Design a protein around this ligand. Structure first.
Ligand SMILES: O=C(/C=C/c1ccccc1)Nc1cc(-c2ccnc(N3CCC(O)CC3)c2)ccn1
Lengths: 231, 230
């Protein structure tokens, strides 16, 4: 499809290639005081979240139809999906066999280097990475699935029919791709409860870090945290 | 002197007599079946937390000087200390060696009968309980310690000097008792670990509010919201 091509283009332009993979901060081995953190570890956690939201914004603007939604619907979709998109894209891009987290900037970081900032949550994201990798989801399928995570019904949409029309198009586009390669779906959905648990673990980690307040969360992440709490 | 007697009287009147201990629901063995909490596990968690409210309020009103603080400082101290008072009193009253939780109602429960409701936090509370038990803290020392948890600086106090003056009186009273019978600074060392445990309680309530199997009762919800520094 021209839509499939557009979706694949956007996905590949929103991550690093094997070339601009940045090992400047990668330490095979550092020795953390587990179950504690300092201001620099918490700043880095928030900065990674922030960089991923900046990058996901630019990816979304390249999904045909998305830029023509009301600005409020664009924000609402982006906020509502951000955490799930962060986890899924990190899982899909990372190397769980080498305990390597690969962030959208090209930054590579060892599990042990993420432990202070992220706590348990990063161990759980690596577990989901292994899970995801075993389903051998090809790039064009992933490029569609990530878009379906974004372009979905949400309470508060001004133009929900336009969002449902676009969701239809991307669902169609995915169906057509899995027919073109057949000559996985049911098993991908079996992993979705892990992914929702991981979204929750994210909110729990942000709550924990807001309680501790070593450094305050950036305003845009704080707004997503608050706007994403059903109470 | 007479303050210590007043503090001991309040502490002993705020818990169950070895008479009113209820083992009717105690199960020595469970199969921790259907893992992942249900409505009943969350209801029980909230009910146990709630059972302490009226008890701790009545205990505090029997600490000399406490009723002489502004009513707004009384509410603020009660809300701010609720979770830590719940934990510390539970740690001291429970039998960590047998994984036995004793609630202020007299209800006795095995850790696995409340692990789904409490999550990890019960393991952490029991760890603290073992720690507390090893200090062989006598009742009059504990009667002062619990009061120091309540009568402490808090953000929003109207009369913070009066609260500090009362904290000083109870600190004096404790010091004098521990001389009459390094051990002192190890009792005081428990207040900060008790705050770290408090945080896990807020994490658990946050988690349960997120999941929303059953909503927290209004008084716990208010304490949760009013004790978040943001
Ligand atoms: O009725 C009770 C206790 C009621 C209570 C407890 C705390 C606050 C308010 C009321 N029965 C009961 C009471 C005790 C108890 C009673 C007195 N002391 C201790 N400690 C424990 C170990 C060391 O720290 C030193 C001694 C434990 C233990 C279990 N059940």
């Amino acid at each position: 499809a021209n839509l499939l091509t557009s979706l694949v283009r956007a996905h590949l332009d929103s991550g690093p290639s094997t070339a601009k993979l940045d090992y400047s901060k990668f330490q095979e081995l550092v020795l953390p005081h587990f179950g504690k953190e300092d201001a620099g570890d918490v700043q880095q956690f928030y900065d990674l979240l922030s960089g991923s939201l900046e990058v996901i914004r630019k990816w979304a603007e390249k999904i045909p139809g998305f830029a023509e939604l009301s600005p409020a619907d664009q924000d609402l979709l982006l906020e509502s999906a951000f955490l799930e998109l962060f986890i899924l894209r990190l899982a899909y891009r990372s190397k769980p066999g080498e305990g390597k987290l690969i962030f959208c900037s090209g930054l590579v970081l060892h599990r042990l280097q993420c432990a202070r900032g992220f706590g348990d949550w990063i161990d759980s994201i690596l577990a989901f990475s292994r899970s995801l990798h075993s389903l051998l989801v090809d790039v064009p399928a992933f490029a569609c699935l990530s878009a379906l995570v974004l372009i979905t019904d949400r309470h508060g949409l001004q133009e929900p029919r336009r969002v449902e029309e676009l969701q239809n198009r991307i669902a169609s586009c995915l169906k057509e791709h899995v027919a073109a390669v057949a000559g996985c779906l049911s098993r991908l959905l079996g992993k979705l409860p892990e992914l929702r648990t991981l979204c929750t673990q994210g909110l729990q980690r942000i709550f924990y870090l807001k309680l501790e307040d070593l450094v305050p969360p950036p305003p845009i992440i704080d707004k997503i945290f608050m706007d994403t709490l059903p109470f």
